Amino acid sequence: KGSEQESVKEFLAKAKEDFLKKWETPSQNTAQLDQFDRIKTLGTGSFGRVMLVKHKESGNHYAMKILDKQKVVKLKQIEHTLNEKRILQAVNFPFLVKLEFSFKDNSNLYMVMEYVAGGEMFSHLRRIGRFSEPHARFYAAQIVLTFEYLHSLDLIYRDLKPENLLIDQQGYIQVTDFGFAKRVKGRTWTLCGTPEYLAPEIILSKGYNKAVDWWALGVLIYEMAAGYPPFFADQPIQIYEKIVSGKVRFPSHFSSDLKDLLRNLLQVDLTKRFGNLKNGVNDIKNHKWFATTDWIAIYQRKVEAPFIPKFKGPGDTSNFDDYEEEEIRVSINEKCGKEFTEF
């Protein structure tokens, strides 16, 4: 409705004022390790390992991330870790992963995350091959609203790619990596992200901004509807060439409306790019390809998902053979306390 369309600003106002509060004075040690019971070890990486845990007071399940202080310092990841936490701690949106708790001890940092049964968008896209445009419309719409939200808080996401897109047990999306995201007011210059998803401005080494996120959406949609990215080659150098010379040959089965949106979002002219015009986000929301989408209902999660993963996460969890390796030793003396005081 007219003026009800304006009621979007009412939520955004409350969203920013709630963000800053947390962004200014961030939370620390909202839990301690002996408040959880280790159920299974879900996976192990370079930072450390992720475990499925049960909160003793509630019986709720989370994916706790343990990351070795000393191993982070080695990997030169101090800045990403801190920035990711500070962003996640302050953020609040249905299609973003929720940092429930956060703490540390002498030996390692702890990020207690809402556990999501359902794989990455990448591997799932491999299985199906390509999504039907109504399927991709459902995923796009979520990424759009997510981006509206984040841009409002003057945050570029800078890392949109299928691997960073987990699927709800409800079949909806959860966005999962924030090591790259920046609270930028004007413009920034850091080269980071995956070649296929870089907007020409990143590659050109001029400054860029939040427009870059809108480009990536374009690439992400194309891939979901085509089963492959629009700009792709056997070398990153070549992938750049094809992006800067932004000529996008669609598949035959691609809708004319879907074509119209893609030529709008995938636009080397960042003064002619959908997302960065008079109406900003609304141009993308009011487009002919998105007339059949109820954004507010997408937000409510009141839209029936096109597919629900049967991940069996909560119960079957990790087969983990029988008796395997796991022990969380916390050192007698503190290590790297200086570097992670902010955490």
Show the tokens assigned to 314: 């909560």
Portions of the chain given CATH number 3.30.200.20? 26-119+311-343
Name residues whose C-beta falls within 8 Å of residue 247's C-beta, 6 or more positions apart in sequence.
none
240 vs 280: CA distance, rounded Å: 27
Q: CB pairs under 8 A, 24+ apart, for 267-270?
A: 267/215, 268/200, 268/244, 270/199, 270/201, 270/211
| Experimental method reported for this structure | X-ray
**CA–CA gap between residue 62 and residue 37 (Å, rounded):** 10
Beta bridge partners of 113: 63, 99
User: Shortest CA distance to 89 belongs to which of 148, 31, 28?
Assistant: 28
Is 257 part of the annotated catalytic residue set? no
Token pair belonging to 175: 């966005």
Indicate the helix (H) or strand (E) that contains 67. Answer: strand 61-68
CA distance 280 to 288: 16
Q: Tell me if the domain spanning 26-119+311-343 has CATH number 3.30.200.20.
A: yes
The resolution in angstroms reads 2.9
Residues in binding site for ATP? 42-50, 65, 114-120, 161-164
Residues in a beta bridge with 167 = 173
Can you list the positions of beta strands (E) in 6-90?
A: 36-44, 48-55, 61-68
The CATH 1.10.510.10 domain(s) of the chain lie at 1-25+120-310
- Catalytic pick from 18, 37, 159, 260? 159
Range list of H helices, 91-199: 121-128, 133-152
Report the DSSP pairing between strands 173-175 and 36-44: unpaired
- Superfamily for domain range 1-25+120-310: Transferase(Phosphotransferase) domain 1 (1.10.510.10)
